[PDB]
């Protein structure tokens with residue numbers, strides 16, 4: 001994941017805002033940024 | 049104006065037109081597919097999303 | 098214990114890093130046609 | 146208000162000074178450094194005896210010390226019937242001193258605000274939001290018609306526009322007619338939506354230090370020097386208190402009986 | 417010919433009139449804020465001009481009217497103050513030791529001036545009357561004067577030895593020096609870094625307004641000691657946060673332009689008419 005790429009996050013709730021959401025206009029939002037740090041993954045070789 | 053307001057902007061006999069503004073919490077999680085190659089077991093074929 | 102070094106990004110090996118999730122506070126606004134009374138239900142639950 | 150007709154030839158009535166001194170109470174709010182410099186503690190009793198010469202009965206005078214101006218700003222209860230507020234001026238405290246003077250001198254009708262649910266406008270010129278607490282840092286994010294920040298992101302409190310920081314009392318005026326989202330430290334500070342009614346006749350502010358700087362009217366254009374914002378120079382708190390005692394008749398003449406059908410009960414030191 | 421100066425306009429005191437002389441050569445009136453750079457420094461934002469334009473649009477000013485202009489500090493803004501614009505407000509951040517420079521910039525902008533040059537190295541100059549000053553503006557002006565006798569002999573200063581001259585303004589961006597009216601004077605300053613002009617004062621420029629952001633009331637535009645007028649346009653506020661100051665100005669903008677009046681405005685942006 002680098003600058004040229006993108007991350008999509010689709011979202012849905014059980015509230016009234018999504019009850020019959022099939023047409024939408026004037027769509028906008030404000031999301032504060034976030035950070036994602038990758039953890040460690042051990043490649044289990046047979047020997048070594 | 050409320051944080052979770054339910055505002056109207058046009059109403060008709062069958063249809064209406066609601067304006068919805070909501071405060072939300074987007075909790076998501078990355079996905080990965082580790083596919084390790086065959087062979088002796090020292091090779092991995094793909095580490096994808 | 099490898100040769101490939103000093104290269105930026107995020108790998109797919111473990112982007113979660115033991116986090117149960119990545120949280121973004123946010124809000125959205127939208128305008129949508131819906132039937133006149135909220136006692137309707139579009140299909141949301143699925144069999145594939 | 147019903148009409149009250151009155152002739153223009155009736156003879157002036159006798160002096161009501163003695164009646165009001167027998168029927169009312171005076172109360173002085175002074176900073177702790179006053180007592181510290183006085184270095185005494187028979188001084189309250191001595192000043193009560195001194196007031197008795199000017200004609201205030203023994204129990205009529207109430208001395209309510211406060212720590213300092215910014216700390217007294219937080220929700221000042223004026224337990225009295227004629228209030229004097231000695232107010233020592235120091236540089237950089239101009240706005241906070243002015244805030245306190247505005248708050249107590251002007252009559253306010255305040256309503257609670259629920260920051261966590263509603264976005265609040267300001268109705269007009271007379272409306273303000275007053276935040277009081279141990280440390281109020283109100284941050285405002287104005288909103289569009291679709292409730293989206295301008296100059297700010299509604300969910301990122303860092304991008305908000307700070308209009309007060311760590312202040313015990315802040316009287317914020319924002320652009321009227323625009324919804325706002327507020328961030329204020331809900332555990333510490335309480336914010337209320339208030340409208341300025343007429344003035345409060347009960348209270349007078351004796352600025353003790355520097356130049357004429359108090360600006361009760363938040364409007365930039367008008368800077369009226371109201372009669373109840375008195376001022377005097379000082380070097381010795383004993384001299385200040387003797388000045389007040391000697392000229393007490395003039396001060397209470399400047400002040401006048403409070404007139405408002407209040408609704409919030411609170412303790413008063415009446416006779 | 418003229419605009420009918422020399423004949424009187426008559427009006428009735430018991431009638432409210434209807435028809436008006438509608439005239440406009442504009443897009444519309446343009447509010448115009450001058451703020452110190454420290455304001456933007458403290459704000460630490462940069463969609464903030466957009467934010468304030470959106471606010472003014474609510475208050476009734478279209479988008480392309482309001483303008484925001486940064487100046488480093490009041491002393492540096494004083495040198496050749498240009499008001500390129502229609503409804504001018506100037507936010508002056510008061511602080512100690514800048515009392516005279518602030519009062520002097522206020523005196524320069526709030527009032528209309530009619531300035532002639534001064535070939536300093538050739539002639540000797542006087543001051544005709546109470547409304548006449550010498551305005552010196554530049555990177556660093558240092559005005560040293562020397563009054564002259566009726567015989568053109570210096571008094572208290574030898575006209576040749578410049579070190580004996582009386583310094584009246586030392587290393588200032590703007591110096592509005594008034595000297596004794598009726599004395600010939602020999603003047604010395606740093607001709608490359610400064611320009612000195614013989615300026616009469618016409619009526620007051622009733623267009624620009626001055627909001628003193630800091631503390632006590634010190635602005636004395638009237639160079640006279642006896643009079644210290646407090647004009648409607650000498651506005652003042654008590655400040656801690658520049659955001660609060662700008663919100664105050666925006667909220668009460670209508671009253672501020674009600675105090676002002678745009679009918680006084682020149683073609684050029686200069687703070688003083690120049691009449692060679």
Ligand SMILES: *[C@@H]1O[C@H](CO)[C@@H](O[C@@H]2O[C@H](CO)[C@@H](O[C@@H]3O[C@H](CO)[C@@H](O)[C@H](O)[C@@H]3O)[C@H](O)[C@H]2NC(C)=O)[C@H](O)[C@H]1NC(C)=O
Pocket residue numbers: 260261302327328329330331
């Ligand atoms: C206005 O802005 C301030 C600045 O952030 C808000 O403070 C935030 O308040 C919430 C709730 O008190 C804090 O949530 C906490 O989250 C941590 C983990 O993220 C959790 O361990 C706690 O139990 C709690 O849920 C949040 O940390 C705090 N923000 C900061 C930077 O400290 C304030 O709430 C805002 N005003 C309103 C009315 O929401």
Ligand SMILES: *[C@@H]1O[C@H](CO)[C@@H](O)[C@H](O)[C@H]1NC(C)=O
Pocket residue numbers: 159
């Ligand atoms: C009012 O004053 C006059 C003159 O001192 C005095 O004669 C009169 O008795 C006073 N009125 C009353 C009610 O005592």
Ligand SMILES: *[C@@H]1O[C@H](CO)[C@@H](O)[C@H](O)[C@H]1NC(C)=O
Pocket residue numbers: 432433434435436
């Ligand atoms: C219209 O304006 C003129 C001034 O040019 C004035 O003389 C006249 O009285 C005005 N109309 C009315 C009805 O008063």
Ligand SMILES: *[C@@H]1O[C@H](CO)[C@@H](O)[C@H](O)[C@H]1NC(C)=O
Pocket residue numbers: 536537578579604605606607
């Ligand atoms: C000002 O005085 C200095 C010192 O004598 C001199 O060098 C300079 O030429 C004078 N300025 C003018 C404009 O003559």
Ligand SMILES: [Ca+2]
Pocket residue numbers: 296297304305306461462
């Ligand atoms: Ca911002």
Ligand SMILES: [Ca+2]
Pocket residue numbers: 240241244312313314315316
């Ligand atoms: Ca304050």
Ligand SMILES: [Ca+2]
Pocket residue numbers: 267269270272273318319320321667
């Ligand atoms: Ca307001």
Ligand SMILES: [Ca+2]
Pocket residue numbers: 360361362363364365366367368369652
């Ligand atoms: Ca004011």
Ligand SMILES: [Ca+2]
Pocket residue numbers: 516517520588589590591592
């Ligand atoms: Ca100067």
Ligand SMILES: [Ca+2]
Pocket residue numbers: 572573580581582
């Ligand atoms: Ca000399």
Ligand SMILES: [Ca+2]
Pocket residue numbers: 543545546548549594595596597
């Ligand atoms: Ca003169």
Ligand SMILES: [Ca+2]
Pocket residue numbers: 636637638639640641642643644645
């Ligand atoms: Ca003067």
